[PDB]
């Protein structure tokens, strides 16, 4: 209330002031270049010039040479010419080439690519913890394995056992698996990278492993870290074209992830969380069992679970407060929290047909019967003998 206002007043003296300072300070009397810049500038232009072909840096050989690939198909044994030092370069980076003679004139690009955009997330997730209602015990299993060793390795050292690493989340749609992962990560306030698996696989040849290796490098730097690889199940044993192919590029990307998993650096301080239907969709190969440690089988909501999840939904439907939380639970048939989402939607759907001006106690009750009826209809009677 009052405090918000305070923050607005402070902003209206901060931003106004800032704008004016910049103009005076940077230029005018002080000068923006102040001579030194002018020198660097003249040299830079010479070495450069437009167009400049963006590149991909394959390996560095200490001898002021590098092996680069450009848009064009053949590779190049190029010289590094000035600017970025060999140290300040990282192989696997996208780099600046001068077009006439291909030499590394710098770096500014740093994997300028939409993938990088999607993966990075420096802040912690939007989900704070056990806002989610029920499957408490379940979520307090994922915390034992992931969170607990990053916060305190002390306990693990004292036992004489390696910390658990990894969890594999598996089971069934509707249990909000994906959500639990975000929840546990927020408490840790681990730098929580997140990526869709569909991006790592593409038709074009050899781009797949570059990207995959990069994930592993970014994660280790920013340890303590969680890598959440969502829709690992996507890749599976889907094989584009069953005449041939899909047994080349696809296979190569899978391989890279695993080769870096344990890696040439010890990344036991990078947890992984894989959300997946099953590991039997994938060609099984998840290396090091105790390196993926505990596996989490999601049961579907039971009776007590769906009370809490219900409570959120009914607060959105106007005036459904009238119908006691408990008796709503009782009257319906045992169903999953997903089917509450279907039911809550059914209430609003019926309110729209009726031109029920404001949602009522009568709508929420009617809603139960039509929702339950849908599910039975869809089922096929094969007759229990």
């Amino acid at each position: 209330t009052r405090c918000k206002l305070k923050l607005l007043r402070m902003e209206r003296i901060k931003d106004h002031l800032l704008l004016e300072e910049e103009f005076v300070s940077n230029s005018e009397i002080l000068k923006p270049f102040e001579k030194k810049q002018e020198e660097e500038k003249k040299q830079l232009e010479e070495i450069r010039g437009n167009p400049l072909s963006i590149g991909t840096l394959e390996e560095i050989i200490d001898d002021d040479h590098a092996i680069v690939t450009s848009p064009t198909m053949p590779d190049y044994y190029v010289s590094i010419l000035s600017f970025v030092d060999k140290e300040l370069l990282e192989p696997g980076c996208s780099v600046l080439l001068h077009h006439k003679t291909m030499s590394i004139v710098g770096v500014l690009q740093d994997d300028a690519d939409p993938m990088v955009s999607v993966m990075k997330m420096d802040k912690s997730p939007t989900e704070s913890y056990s806002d989610i209602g029920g499957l408490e015990s379940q979520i307090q299993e994922i915390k034992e394995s992931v969170e607990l060793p990053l916060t305190h390795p002390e306990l693990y050292e004292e036992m004489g056992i390696k910390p658990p690493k990894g969890v594999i989340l598996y089971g069934a749609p509707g249990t909000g698996k994906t959500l639990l992962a975000k929840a546990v990560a927020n408490q840790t306030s681990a730098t929580f990278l997140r990526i869709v698996g569909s991006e790592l696989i593409q038709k074009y040849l050899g781009d797949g492993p570059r990207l995959c290796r990069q994930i592993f490098k970014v994660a280790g730097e920013n340890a303590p870290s969680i890598v959440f690889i969502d829709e690992i199940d996507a890749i599976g044993t889907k094989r584009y074209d069953s005449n041939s192919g899909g047994e080349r590029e696809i296979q190569r990307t899978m391989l890279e992830l695993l080769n870096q998993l344990d890696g040439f650096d010890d990344r036991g301080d990078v947890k992984v969380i894989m959300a997946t239907n099953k590991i039997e969709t994938l060609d099984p190969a998840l290396i090091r069992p105790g390196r993926i440690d505990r596996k989490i089988l999601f049961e579907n909501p039971d009776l007590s679970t769906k009370k809490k999840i219900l409570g959120i939904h009914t607060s959105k439907m106007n005036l459904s407060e009238d119908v006691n939380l408990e008796t709503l639970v009782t009257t319906k048939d045992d169903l999953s929290g997903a089917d509450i989402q279907a039911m809550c939607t059914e209430a609003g759907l019926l309110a729209l047909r009726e031109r029920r001006m404001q949602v009522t106690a009568e709508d929420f009750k009617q809603a139960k019967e039509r929702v339950m009826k849908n599910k039975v209809e869809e089922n096929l009677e094969g007759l229990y003998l």
Binding site: L17, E20, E21, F23, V24, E28, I29
Partner: protein
């Protein structure tokens, strides 16, 4: 003035205009708060 004299004059104003508003405003406020083209040559004699 020609091009040379103009260039100095113009940059010279611009510094001062930005610099006045960048300080004058903040101090002051809180100070208080606390043709005849055709017209030939006039028929009058002139020396």
């Amino acid at each position: 003035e020609e091009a040379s004299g103009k260039e100095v004059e113009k940059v010279a104003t611009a510094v001062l205009s930005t610099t006045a508003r960048a300080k004058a405003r903040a101090k002051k406020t809180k100070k208080e708060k606390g043709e005849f083209y055709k017209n030939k040559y006039s028929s009058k004699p002139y020396k």
